[PDB]
């Protein structure tokens, strides 16, 4: 996250921290995600596409730090790693950039709500907030696009939803943004998602509850003029989510 402020998991308790085991045993951070029900975390396909073995991944909930333990955190294996079969990448765009992780503890449990762990609501089919609405994004991604380290403490910031008309201008992104994506940015371009924030939530208030409106996907640079963050538009993927979350 570029700009914004440090926070703790209590302010974004649906945030999931996803790591991969490396052959030979080092473990490194992969991507963020969001807890949408006790057994299910939603994230971005592109995070996993290079390494689709569920076995290599570890998911933490209730975790406020990147490389040290938080009191109340919970560790899960990935029972099911579900990537979107129609994922593709064009020159800029990532299409159908959405993934599901079924989680369970070694003990066989799913997540249990606490001070530091809560689910986030899904929006109703095609129900988004109005353009110009302020939303929040969260992650362990870079604080500057040129950095080589990630911050050790969770960050978050506020961005505003941009109209498709605006985001599709040729000096922004043109046709690379489809109706299955949402753009969001700071009006003065001073804060943004960045590398390492993928899979993380874009959260907006909708019908009086915090709702998962988007998933951090892609963009040109970080916090550059006329280059907003692009997010997978969750409200257009409900059937996919429902189908892949059924028994």
């Amino acid at each position: 996250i570029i700009g914004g402020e440090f926070t703790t998991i209590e302010n974004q308790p649906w945030f999931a921290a996803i790591y991969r085991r490396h052959r030979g045993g080092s473990v490194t951070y992969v991507c963020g995600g969001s807890l949408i029900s006790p057994c299910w975390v939603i994230s971005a396909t592109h995070c996993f596409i290079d390494y689709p073995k569920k076995e290599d991944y570890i998911v933490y909930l209730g975790r406020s730090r990147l490389n040290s333990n938080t009191q109340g955190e919970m560790k899960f294996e990935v029972e099911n790693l579900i990537l979107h079969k129609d994922y593709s990448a064009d020159t800029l765009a990532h299409h159908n950039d959405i993934a599901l992780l079924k989680i369970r503890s070694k003990e066989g449990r799913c997540a249990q709500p606490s001070r530091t762990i809560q689910t986030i609501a899904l929006p109703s089919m095609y129900n988004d907030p109005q353009f110009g609405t302020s939303c929040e994004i969260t992650g362990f991604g870079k604080e500057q696009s040129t950095d080589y380290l990630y911050p050790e403490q969770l960050k978050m910031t506020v961005v505003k939803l941009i109209s498709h008309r605006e985001c599709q201008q040729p000096h922004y992104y043109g046709s690379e943004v489809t109706t299955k994506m949402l753009c969001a940015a700071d009006p003065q371009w001073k804060t943004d998602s960045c590398q390492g924030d993928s899979g993380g939530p874009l959260v907006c208030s909708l019908q009086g509850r915090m709702t998962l409106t988007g998933i951090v996907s892609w963009g040109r640079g970080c916090a550059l003029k006329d280059k907003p963050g692009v997010y997978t538009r969750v409200s257009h993927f409900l059937p996919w989510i429902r189908s892949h979350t059924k028994e």
Partner: peptide, 4 residues
Amino acid sequence: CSAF
């Protein structure tokens, strides 16, 4: 790369 544009990928997040």
